[PDB]
């Protein structure tokens, strides 16, 4: 075939649509409605799923960035070992993202509070789970992009400074851009934390 994976992906999506449409034809378009289950979900769902991602994405992105940077540094090290003293500052960029990614977990845990099965669907706790889940998503994605971008920039610097290593300052302003993403992702989440409540 053209590709088994895409073939199966195409084959799967049709059946759910057919089931939903026939279910509507039997008079159940709203009877089986997403909002019903959303009301039937739990804030612990959102809390426990939106917390692991918050730090997992940040750490994975930092790992990818450092993955790139080390393999870039080795190339320039052979020809010129003194590339190291100049270039170590760059990797700091890929590391620093992880701490800002993980710190959000602590404020989340502060918002975390044992909640009983009563009032277990209201905004007292459902709102907080929603908000922290969204913030975790944003910070994780921001840290992924930050890490990958800084990794590729570090690789570029590695391949460049091998010849005419004195050009580091001429390019670090570009890596400033890649660094900005961590702050951009952190500030919005922190602002959210200034508006959301805690679990109840």
């Amino acid at each position: 075939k053209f590709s088994f994976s895409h073939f199966l992906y195409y084959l799967v999506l049709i059946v759910v649509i057919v089931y939903g449409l026939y279910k509507l034809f039997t008079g159940h378009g709203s009877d089986i409605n997403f909002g019903k289950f959303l009301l039937r979900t739990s804030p612990y769902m959102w809390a426990n799923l939106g917390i692991a991602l918050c730090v997992g994405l940040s750490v994975v992105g930092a790992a990818w960035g450092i993955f790139i940077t080390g393999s870039s540094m080795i190339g320039a090290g052979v020809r010129a070992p003194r590339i190291t003293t100049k270039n170590l500052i760059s990797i700091i960029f890929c590391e620093v993202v992880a701490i800002y990614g993980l710190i959000i977990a602590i404020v989340f845990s502060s918002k975390l509070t044992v909640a009983t099965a009563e009032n277990m669907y209201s905004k007292s706790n459902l709102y907080t789970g929603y908000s922290l889940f969204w913030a975790g998503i944003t910070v994780g994605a921001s840290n992924l992009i930050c890490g990958i971008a800084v990794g590729i920039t570090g690789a570029t610097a590695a391949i460049s400074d091998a010849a005419d290593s004195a050009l580091f300052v001429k390019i670090l302003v570009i890596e400033i851009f890649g660094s900005i993403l961590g702050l951009l992702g952190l500030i919005v989440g922190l602002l959210m934390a200034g508006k959301a409540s805690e679990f109840q």
Binding site: Y44, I51, A52, G56, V59, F67, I74, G77, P81, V114
Partner: protein, 159 residues
């Protein structure tokens, strides 16, 4: 059922422990399958690398224990009376740390496989490689904070 008494909280703890333990295993295995073979392709003709630069093996093996420690930490706390507020953190706590270990081991293995050849062609460079390795390991180590937070939330309070 209600948070007071469910029928599936221990199920969730067990599956979360399984997730973490399997995650750490493959996180190690990737870095091993890279670095071990990469070095063995070199030290055969580079006998001066028998034990002087086998650090990546240990660096990767370090991550193999977080799954075990979390699994045993949850092992003491089991039964069908665990709370649901403390019945679902099991999945997230385990998976976050596990995938952190996966990524850290991936990054560790790439540079570990690079370093053996870098030193063979130029044995003065790993001074930076091990530094980057230790910089990478803290990435996986990070998740243990939330790991312990949720472990205390669950094991200490089950309802």
């Amino acid at each position: 059922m209600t948070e007071l008494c469910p029928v599936y909280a221990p199920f969730f703890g067990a599956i979360g422990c399984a997730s973490a333990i399997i995650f750490t295993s493959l996180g190690a295995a990737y870095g091993t399958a890279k670095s071990g073979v990469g070095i063995c392709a070199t030290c055969v003709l580079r006998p001066d690398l028998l034990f002087k630069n086998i650090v990546p093996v240990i660096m990767a093996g370090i991550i193999a224990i977080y799954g075990l420690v979390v699994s045993v930490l949850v092992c003491y706390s089991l039964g069908q009376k665990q709370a649901l507020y403390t019945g679902f953190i099991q999945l997230g706590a385990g998976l976050s740390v596990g995938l952190s270990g996966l990524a850290a081991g991936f990054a560790i293995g790439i540079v570990g496989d690079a370093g053996v050849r870098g030193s063979s062609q130029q044995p003065r460079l790993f001074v930076g490689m091990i530094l980057i390795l230790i910089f990478a390991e803290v990435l996986g180590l990070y998740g243990l904070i939330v790991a312990l937070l949720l472990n205390s939330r669950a094991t200490q309070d089950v309802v």
